[PDB]
């Protein structure tokens, strides 16, 4: 991809965030995809504005900004390429065993906030040989 | 019959005589201040209910 970012002026983009949605047709088969505009708008923090190119449409974004878009792309591209990639973009998961151990604190506390209740154990009444019977 | 569907009252009187008041008097307050055979006693409780 380039670093030219369509001007969000009305003289050259029309109708930019006139609705909250923008639209992109994806490949040869033309897949439709819809982002909102905020997730667009981000990127007009980075665009500068100093720099204008093709009849003064276009500007350009920082090149941190610009390269680290680049390399999400390229981390998305190499895991559908692999086969082997770590599924659940989301990254190492550590917080299942604090999750098991307040479940079974949870389970242990009520079962143990119920026999406080269920044994207050007034008196008993044992049938005795000589004495009670 | 009824050694099998009550109590004996030589096992009571065992506990009751030996056990029990030894620990203290006026509510029999607590446990540690006896024997291991507390264990035993225990063990004649998982009897007796599960006799009666």
Redesign the interface.
Known sequence: MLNFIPKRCPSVSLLFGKRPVQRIEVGQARHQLEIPVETIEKIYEGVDSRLEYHNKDYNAMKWKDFMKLKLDAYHLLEASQSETAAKSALSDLNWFSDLADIYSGQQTMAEMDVALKAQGEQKLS??????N? | F??TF????TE?QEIKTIVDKCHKGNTFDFHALSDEELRRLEQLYST?NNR?
């Open positions: 044992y049938p005795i040989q000589g004495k019977i | 009824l050694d009550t109590v004996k009252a009571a007796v009666v």
